Amino acid sequence: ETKCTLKSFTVEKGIYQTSNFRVQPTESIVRFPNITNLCPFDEVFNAT
Amino acid sequence: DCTMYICGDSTECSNLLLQYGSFCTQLKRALTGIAVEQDKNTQEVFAQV
């Protein structure tokens, strides 16, 4: 990794930085209202 | 860091950013030089014995 970062094949002694590390998400979620409201269609189709 | 600041957690944003490339590499080199000189200042001032 440090050879890749410095863009060479030989590196002298010392400390070298590189790309950061970041935790990827385990999975995915989606959220949306609750949702209580319902259009009154059971009354519509039971109309006498 | 380049990507974390500019294109945070966005793979395609990093893909586009890769076109510039060496730009932020120069930034990292400059800041690292600044930090090393910062340490050297104290080393020079206090360590004369």
UniProtKB/Swiss-Prot annotation, chain A:
<feature type="glycosylation site" description="O-linked (GalNAc) threonine; by host">
    <location>
        <position position="26"/>
    </location>
</feature>
<feature type="glycosylation site" description="N-linked (GlcNAc...) (complex) asparagine; by host">
    <location>
        <position position="34"/>
    </location>
</feature>
<feature type="glycosylation site" description="N-linked (GlcNAc...) (complex) asparagine; by host">
    <location>
        <position position="46"/>
    </location>
</feature>
<comment type="subunit">
    <text>Binds to host ACE2. RBD also interacts with the N-linked glycan on 'Asn-90' of ACE2. Cleavage of S generates a polybasic C-terminal sequence on S1 that binds to host Neuropilin-1 (NRP1) and Neuropilin-2 (NRP2) receptors. Interacts with host integrin alpha-5/beta-1 (ITGA5:ITGB1) and with ACE2 in complex with integrin alpha-5/beta-1 (ITGA5:ITGB1). May interact via cytoplasmic c-terminus with M protein. May interact (via N-terminus) with host bilirubin and biliverdin, thereby preventing antibody binding to the SARS-CoV-2 spike NTD via an allosteric mechanism.</text>
</comment>
<feature type="glycosylation site" description="O-linked (HexNAc...) serine; by host">
    <location>
        <position position="28"/>
    </location>
</feature>
<feature type="region of interest" description="Disordered">
    <location>
        <begin position="22"/>
        <end position="38"/>
    </location>
</feature>
<protein>
    <recommendedName>
        <fullName>Spike protein S1</fullName>
    </recommendedName>
</protein>
<comment type="function">
    <text>Attaches the virion to the cell membrane by interacting with host receptor, initiating the infection. The major receptor is host ACE2. When S2/S2' has been cleaved, binding to the receptor triggers direct fusion at the cell membrane. When S2/S2' has not been cleaved, binding to the receptor results in internalization of the virus by endocytosis using host TFRC and GRM2 and leading to fusion of the virion membrane with the host endosomal membrane. Alternatively, may use NRP1/NRP2 and integrin as entry receptors.</text>
</comment>
Curated annotation (Swiss-Prot), chain B:
<comment type="function">
    <text>Precursor of the fusion protein processed in the biosynthesis of the S protein and the formation of virus particle. Mediates fusion of the virion and cellular membranes by functioning as a class I viral fusion protein. Contains two viral fusion peptides that are unmasked after cleavage. The S2/S2' cleavage occurs during virus entry at the cell membrane by host TMPRSS2 or during endocytosis by host CSTL.</text>
</comment>
<feature type="disulfide bond">
    <location>
        <begin position="7"/>
        <end position="13"/>
    </location>
</feature>
<feature type="disulfide bond">
    <location>
        <begin position="2"/>
        <end position="24"/>
    </location>
</feature>
<protein>
    <recommendedName>
        <fullName>Spike protein S2</fullName>
    </recommendedName>
</protein>
